[PDB]
Amino acid sequence: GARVAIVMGSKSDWATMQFAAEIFEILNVPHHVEVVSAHRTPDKLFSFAESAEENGYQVIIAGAGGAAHLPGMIAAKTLVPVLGVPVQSAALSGVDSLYSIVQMPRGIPVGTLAIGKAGAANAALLAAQILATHDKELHQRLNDWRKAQTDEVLENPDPRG
Amino acid sequence: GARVAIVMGSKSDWATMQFAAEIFEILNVPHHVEVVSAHRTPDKLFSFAESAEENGYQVIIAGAGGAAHLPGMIAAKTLVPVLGVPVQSAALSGVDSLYSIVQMPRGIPVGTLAIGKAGAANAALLAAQILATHDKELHQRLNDWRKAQTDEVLENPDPRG
Amino acid sequence: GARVAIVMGSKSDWATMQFAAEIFEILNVPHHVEVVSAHRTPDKLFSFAESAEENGYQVIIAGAGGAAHLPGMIAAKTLVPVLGVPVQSAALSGVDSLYSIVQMPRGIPVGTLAIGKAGAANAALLAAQILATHDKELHQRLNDWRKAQTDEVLENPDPRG
Amino acid sequence: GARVAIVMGSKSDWATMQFAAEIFEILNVPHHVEVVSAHRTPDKLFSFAESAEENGYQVIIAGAGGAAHLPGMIAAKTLVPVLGVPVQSAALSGVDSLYSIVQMPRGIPVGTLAIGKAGAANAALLAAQILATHDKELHQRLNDWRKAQTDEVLENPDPRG
Amino acid sequence: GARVAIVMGSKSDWATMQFAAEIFEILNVPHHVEVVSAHRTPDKLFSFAESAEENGYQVIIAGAGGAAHLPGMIAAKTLVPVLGVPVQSAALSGVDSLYSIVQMPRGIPVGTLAIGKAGAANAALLAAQILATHDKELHQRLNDWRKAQTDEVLENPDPRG
Amino acid sequence: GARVAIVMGSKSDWATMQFAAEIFEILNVPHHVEVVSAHRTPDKLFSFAESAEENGYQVIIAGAGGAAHLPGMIAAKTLVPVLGVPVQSAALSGVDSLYSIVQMPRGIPVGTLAIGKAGAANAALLAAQILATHDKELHQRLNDWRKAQTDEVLENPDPRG
Amino acid sequence: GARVAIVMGSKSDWATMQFAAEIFEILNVPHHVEVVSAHRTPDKLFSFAESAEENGYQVIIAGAGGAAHLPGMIAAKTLVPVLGVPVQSAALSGVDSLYSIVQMPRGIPVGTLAIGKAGAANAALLAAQILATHDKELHQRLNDWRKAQTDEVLENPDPRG
Amino acid sequence: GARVAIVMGSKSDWATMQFAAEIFEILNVPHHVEVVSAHRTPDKLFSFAESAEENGYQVIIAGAGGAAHLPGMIAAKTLVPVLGVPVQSAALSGVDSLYSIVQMPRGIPVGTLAIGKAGAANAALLAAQILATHDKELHQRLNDWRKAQTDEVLENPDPRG
């Protein structure tokens, strides 16, 4: 039963959002992936948001670039926690994406992660850490993964050839 | 019949948007003023946008600050030209408002004006110029207003005491 | 009878402005294209602006980069609505272009669109939406185009291979 | 039992973080408030983080300004979801705070909220929504609070005098 | 005969440009002061620029804020050296003024000075140095003024009480 | 007799500064080119500045990148007008270069041009316009050059193939 | 014997630099305070730097704002470690000060601290730590001061009323 | 006996930090190189910092990118002077790296150098200048190196072919 949904504004955002899905495959977390555009498919955004709780979603990861309205508009139509990922734009290098997602007004929150693929991965890890509060097995797998990252750095202290 | 609607996300944006209305009072252009919140009242945003054409609007002036989603979400739900006004935010001084409104993707346009009260006035003036294309009287009133502004500067060339 | 004019500062801006012209070909909207430089051909800017109304232009789309004075100087010499498109500059990535076009003072408005090719396309769509207020046929073609974009996103929900 | 901890780098950040606590008072959510400095008390930061799970916390809200290392260093020492709030700095207006919290590398996530008091309130709301996934009463209290905010705007449509 | 002209877009810019004039009063350099608006009085801008040489000017100091088109449009209509002064704007703190003046394309130069009152003073000083190349008396008065500023700092080495 | 000097901080700045020299070759203006480093050869900077007037220089064009101290330090040791050109840096895209040259304090002025090759060319044109005030022949050649640029734009109005 | 010198460009920078001196008073470190202007007194800057070693200085703390050339020009004339403090400028809020000091090219280093009073205090502390490497008493006084700051935060965990 | 330590957050930072090590090889200064991650290996950061003095380190050079917490967290656990080098990040071009390292609060100082390879080299030179205060031989080698850089610029004044 998929407890987290990964949505994005364009299929072109998959370059970035695929990094969220990758973490879920490693940690073995069931998820739904879908393209929902705030500007090109506004009515689908509403229907999606309104039915998120019924479909069992406990966390939603939304990514978008430029005038990134996707994460914020989903959060306005549901009480399910929303995490936003700023996709790096061409002209402004993602600064516009970040400002559009992070500067939400009092009342409707969106947990924002880094700009780019690093943020997509982190959004996935954050959602996993949220689920892991009530999933001892996932909590254990997260623990092992984090130890693997640490150990890889510890067993390779010298960067020189 | 009001051909132009002035909307905003909060009653606190009125301190800025009131300058848009002041222009319409002077040019004698009927207008509707309303508070429509993209995040607090997402449903009303949809009904307002969907019925904008039937209600007779030919131009919509939407103001908002911070992660300003209001202008763009309206433009996504109607073919009525939308003009956005970035309200000056505390921390980022309206740069976040600007990027949220101006950086719209290909397909759903939003004509953006200056940050603050100057942009509010200009949104009204640009809307009046759009209407003036098919309104000879308004067109003439506009011409007279612009000559007044010009004349005022021409008859006060020395700024010194 | 061409009702919208697309002007630019250099022939090098065509890389971007050609995206405005493209929308007009799809929507079958007659238009005039011309290179008018605010700094290299200032007298032509004036003559062009002064005669825009007589030549039947109802909307003007001006694009420029760096110290983008073109859109704002045209708006100062005519009551015909002007839409500005910030061309992406090398050093500042279009931030200088944006600030030059959007920060107009009270009295002379310029509707600004996104930085780059997305803004050029949008300026064309905005001008089309303005004309469509008094053109039931164009309004219908705009409607079909917008439905085509939406449907393309709806019939391709999964971004995965 | 307090399921959420609110930490901050200085007692001077309380002017901002107090808005996070105000949300918990209204929603009736038990919380712990403490001053933990990443640079002045680095050892306490470690003990606090290491024992966060045993102490029963399911969400940590960390606020800080300038080179805001607090949120990230906590997230590095625990699997308990960390949400960061950038406190508005004097010179850079919170832009340095934002970048310090949001730009975390792949592996150690930190959900970032708006700059200032608005983000403090939203961190509390996001934390409450995370808990509300497994707390039907809190979930209902959240629903009621959000309807109150919506209703308030809907019954005050005209901002004018 | 006044060899230097000081122009500005608004009488409100005088609060900044008055520091340029103060320098000329001290150095005893004849100057002309006038309000020339690029957007409100575009025709006067042209006449002023076209006749600058015949009127005997050898340097023009133009100040403006926001989308500061004034300096550049003057430089486009005359071969008389133009020096621009960015006036500090409210929202963007003169960054928009700076970019509008400094980022001129190849062909039409504008020597830009600091933002605000410091740049106004320096525009006057740079103009005086240009004239001083062919004015031995002014050259000497400049030397004396600069030694006075130096001497003042040298005879007050301790800033403490 | 060379009346203008082109100096730079590194031989690597020639990629940009060569555009200043190019204008002088076209306009047939004698000039001196030299590498003077403010940080690597501080004593040579002083000797150069101190003897600029004796060597007959009437204008100095200095270019540098990053912490661009060259233009400002030359201006402090001479009354000969100094024009600064911000070389585009790698990390900050020339924003650091611009701020370092343009924000001079009251007393020591530096006329700043655009970032990059466009500014280098313009610095040369500005220096030429300064010399042309007392050189009827150069004034004529500048006039022809400007007409050639204008005419090239006028005889090529359509950017389309 | 004073082993550390605190210089600044203006007596107006004292409002910031006084915090560097306050640290030395508390740690009982002999220091010299002086106003040395890079632009108004370029000759004194050279004599000061050249004789810094003979005068017994082992660390130099230089503060300046705007186009802050002071720190770098001193570092160019001496091998005595220079630490720079960016003074908060009006318009750009110290960003220009930061870039002028921090972006030094390869060869001539300048250790840069925070913008404003916080950086002034830290320059003093960093200087004291450098001296403390060969001064056991100062080293101990430093240890005691740091424990005092830590203890203060540890014995005031609750910021609330 | 190695008196300076070069640490970094990833082995990917070696592309930049290798420029610090290069200066030390030229100047023949013994040094230790190691990968210490603030987020992936937080406990190693503490152990490293705590034992820096015992291992004889008199200066520590730490480099990191993005949310660069490494330099600041080391400085919090030791009195050994820390120098920070901002590694150039992809999205924000190192601006996030700079803000994360330089904006330390009062009490814990980190001497910051330029963004990129130029800062890495300079951090090494600054650490060498600190050691050279009590090493007449190193002081002499630094002196020769600096004269070699100056002379190379002096014997190649003309940048033209």
Ligand SMILES: Nc1cncn1[C@@H]1O[C@H](COP(=O)(O)O)[C@@H](O)[C@H]1O
């Ligand atoms: N569009 C929107 C939806 N929910 C909040 N806003 C924006 O929040 C800003 C100020 O927030 P507030 O009034 O709540 O303090 C206003 O400009 C308004 O557009």
Ligand SMILES: Nc1cncn1[C@@H]1O[C@H](COP(=O)(O)O)[C@@H](O)[C@H]1O
């Ligand atoms: N986390 C931390 C550790 N040492 C200082 N801070 C941060 O420093 C900022 C204000 O600086 P100060 O305490 O020196 O006044 C606060 O936002 C606080 O988070």
Ligand SMILES: Nc1cncn1[C@@H]1O[C@H](COP(=O)(O)O)[C@@H](O)[C@H]1O
């Ligand atoms: N050059 C110009 C033409 N029309 C307006 N300005 C600029 O607008 C700024 C302030 O606008 P306002 O007069 O509306 O307050 C001034 O700096 C002035 O240069």
Ligand SMILES: Nc1cncn1[C@@H]1O[C@H](COP(=O)(O)O)[C@@H](O)[C@H]1O
């Ligand atoms: N370095 C320098 C040389 N001449 C002026 N400054 C700088 O100018 C700033 C303030 O400008 P002013 O002295 O004109 O008021 C101060 O921070 C000072 O460092």
